[PDB]
Each structure stands twice: as structure tokens, then as C-alpha cells.
């Protein structure tokens, strides 16, 4: 995909730039929008370290696809942290290109 692929390529850079406050705001918005049940919310919030909480959030991202990942990317743009400026096509671009063979490396 796109937002889930961006996460599955720069997960540790996202986890370094974002904080438990960004993660908590994402989880709170997801719970307010009923994208996460309390049963999964506690499994994503019982980890002993903030780094591992986001690692569990990123597993739930792959179950949902291009919606649960898109709000994490939107939360980063709303929090204007500048470390992630090469953002993906999360319906936020001024004019989206043809999105055909854009090319990729890691």
C-alpha cells in the first residue's frame, strides 16, 4: 500500500520523531472514531516502553490498511515536527500525480 508502506519502511524514524503524546493522541482519535476496540487499545497500551506501544499500533495498522495508518501520518502533519517532510499521498497533496512507477528504495 501507501501509508502502511511508509510506516513499514521508516517505522523507527517515525518512533524517534513522534512521542508517547503523538501515539496517545492517535489512539484517542482512533477510539473516538471507533477504529480501535478497548480490547486492542489495552494490548497497544500495556507495553513497558513507548517504542513498543507504537510497534503494536503498527501491527493494527496492517489489519485495517490505508485508514488507521493515514491518521498516524495526519497526526504527524498536524504536529508539524519537520523530521518526516517527505510525507506520502495521504489525500493531503495540492495535486496528486499519476502515481505510476514513482520508484522506491530502502
Curated annotation (Swiss-Prot):
Belongs to the protein kinase superfamily. TKL Ser/Thr protein kinase family. Changing residue 38 to D: Abolished activation of NF-kappa-B. Serine/threonine/tyrosine-protein kinase that plays an essential role in modulation of innate and adaptive immune responses. Acts as a key effector of NOD1 and NOD2 signaling pathways: upon activation by bacterial peptidoglycans, NOD1 and NOD2 oligomerize and recruit RIPK2 via CARD-CARD domains, leading to the formation of RIPK2 filaments. Changing residue 37 to A/K: Decreased homooligomerization and ability to transmit NOD2 signaling. Changing residue 22 to S: Decreased homooligomerization and ability to transmit NOD2 signaling. The modification Phosphotyrosine is found at residue 41. Changing residue 67 to R: Decreased interaction with NGFR. This is Receptor-interacting serine/threonine-protein kinase 2. Detected in heart, brain, placenta, lung, peripheral blood leukocytes, spleen, kidney, testis, prostate, pancreas and lymph node.
Amino acid at each position: 500500500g501507501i501509508a502502511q508502506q511508509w510506516i513499514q519502511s521508516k517505522r523507527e524514524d517515525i518512533v524517534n520523531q513522534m512521542t508517547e503524546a503523538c501515539l496517545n493522541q492517535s489512539l484517542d482519535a482512533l477510539l473516538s472514531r471507533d477504529l480501535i476496540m478497548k480490547e486492542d487499545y489495552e494490548l497497544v497500551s500495556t507495553k513497558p516502553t513507548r517504542t513498543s506501544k507504537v510497534r503494536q499500533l503498527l501491527d493494527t495498522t496492517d489489519i485495517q490498511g490505508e485508514e488507521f495508518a493515514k491518521v498516524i501520518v495526519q497526526k504527524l502533519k498536524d504536529n508539524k515536527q519537520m523530521g518526516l517532510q517527505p510525507y506520502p499521498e495521504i489525500l493531503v497533496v495540492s495535486r496528486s500525480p499519476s502515481l505510476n512507477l514513482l520508484q522506491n528504495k530502502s
